[PDB]
Amino acid sequence: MRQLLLISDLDNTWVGDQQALEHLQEYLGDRRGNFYLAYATGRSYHSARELQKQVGLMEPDYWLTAVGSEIYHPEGLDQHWADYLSEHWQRDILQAIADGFEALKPQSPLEQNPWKISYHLDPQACPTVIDQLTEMLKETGIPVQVIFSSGKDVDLLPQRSNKGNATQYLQQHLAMEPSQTLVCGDSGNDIGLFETSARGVIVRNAQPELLHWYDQWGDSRHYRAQSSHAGAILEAIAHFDFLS
Ligand SMILES: OC[C@H]1O[C@@](CO)(O[C@H]2O[C@H](CO)[C@@H](O)[C@H](O)[C@H]2O)[C@@H](O)[C@@H]1O
Ligand SMILES: [Mg+2]
Numbered sequence: 001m002r003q004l005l006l007i008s009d010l011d012n013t014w015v016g017d018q019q020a021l022e023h024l025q026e027y028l029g030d031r032r033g034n035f036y037l038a039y040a041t042g043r044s045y046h047s048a049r050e051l052q053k054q055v056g057l058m059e060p061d062y063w064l065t066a067v068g069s070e071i072y073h074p075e076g077l078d079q080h081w082a083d084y085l086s087e088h089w090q091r092d093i094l095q096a097i098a099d100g101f102e103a104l105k106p107q108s109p110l111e112q113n114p115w116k117i118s119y120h121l122d123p124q125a126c127p128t129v130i131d132q133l134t135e136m137l138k139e140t141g142i143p144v145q146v147i148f149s150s151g152k153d154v155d156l157l158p159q160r161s162n163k164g165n166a167t168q169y170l171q172q173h174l175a176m177e178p179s180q181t182l183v184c185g186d187s188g189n190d191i192g193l194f195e196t197s198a199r200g201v202i203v204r205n206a207q208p209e210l211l212h213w214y215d216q217w218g219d220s221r222h223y224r225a226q227s228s229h230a231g232a233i234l235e236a237i238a239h240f241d242f243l244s
Contacts, residue, residue, distance in 0.1 A: 004035035004242045005176040007064070007167050007193065008184035008233060010048065011041065013203050015055050017229035024230035025058045032058075034243055036174055040064035040163040042155070042189045044110060045072055067147060067155055067189050068166025069115040081169060085115045085158045090142050094156050097137055103129045104154060117156035121148075130154060149188030150207050164192030171198070182242055184233050185210060194222055201236030204228035 006028075008014045015021060028035070037060040041048050045065045051057065063072040069085060071078040095117050098104055103125035107118040121130065133154070134146040143159030163185075171181055181198030185191070188209035194200045199221050202214055205228035214222060223239050225232035237243060 002033070002035050002176075003180060004237075005038070005171060005174060005181040005198075006035050006184075006233070006237075007038045007040050007163075007170070007181065007198070009041055009163070009186055009190050009193075010039050010043065010051060010057070012186045012205060012207075012229065013184050013190075014039065014057065014230050014233065015051060016205070017231060018055065020227070020230035020234075021055060021057075024234055025056075027234060029058065031243055036061045036170075036176065038062040038064055038167070038170055040068060040166060040183070040190075040193065042067045042149070042153070044113065045070060047110070062170060064163060064166040064170070066113050066116045067157055067161070068163040068192065069113055069157055069161045071166055071169070081166075082114070084169075085161050087158075088141075088143055089115060089158045090140075091115070091117060093140060094137055094142060094144055097140070098133065098154075098156060101129065101133055104133070107153075115158050115161055119154040119156075121152050121154055123152065127151065147189045147192075149190075149209060151209070153189070155189060162192030163190060164194070164196045167193055167196055167198065182233075182236055182240060184236065188213075194218075197221065199223070199236070199240045199242075201225050201232050201239070203232040 039060045071081045103122045104119040137144045145157045147155040178197040183193035183200045186203045187207035201223045225235045227235045
């Protein structure tokens with residue numbers, strides 16, 4: 001029932017340029033009831049909440065955490081989403097495979113959750129190993145996704161759990177149309193958002209994976225901002241003429 005569904009990544013997108021963050025929130029703050037805000041981050045809910053205390057993120061309506069593997073309404077975790085991602089998902093098998101790669105190192109236990117298996121790719125390792133990993137995991141019957149961002153972070157998620165599917169779920173939950181949605185990303189863990197038919201903005205300081213993705217799949221609904229960080233969101237909002 002609001003005119004805009006704003007979905008944005010936190011690190012390097014919304015957060016990063018403190019001044020931009022501040023004038024972005026000052027702008028949105030004056031029409032807060034005109035849009036639903038969702039932070040689609042790769043951080044765990046607890047980690048997202050910490051960042052908010054640190055930089056002062058404005059309170060969102062929903063939290064799409066851990067790359068969309070955990071959605072949080074004010075009331076709490078969306079148990080429907082959790083049960084939806086749980087189907088046909090065998091975390092243990094996938095992890096056994098991933099652990100097998102010498103180039104992959106497990107990320108802290110706190111970066112892990114029932115539907116997210118994260119690793120760090122060795123800086124000296126050849127990235128093509130991630131394609132090797134992807135097909136190896138994909139060839140198990142298990143519906144998996146491999147998210148590779150910033151050249152090091154690797155995330156194994158259910159095939160129906162990236163930020164893009166979380167967003168689509170949210171659009172249906174809110175009865176918000178794709179033309180009313182704006183997704184803001186900066187890295188490879190944001191590609192899912194841009195695979196959505198929602199208007200999107202790629203921040204200037206975007207990661208190579210995303211810039212590369214934009215070169216091959218970038219459509220007219222996708223906008224490459226000149227501004228970096230939160231400034232890109234204002235730029236996009238003005239661009240797609242949202243919140244007229
Ligand atoms: O935005 C990149 C930046 O986010 C961090 C924050 O801790 O990592 C999050 O996003 C990664 C990619 O989605 C996940 O693999 C990771 O588990 C999650 O915490 C930084 O590590 C990263 O540089
Ligand atoms: Mg990102």
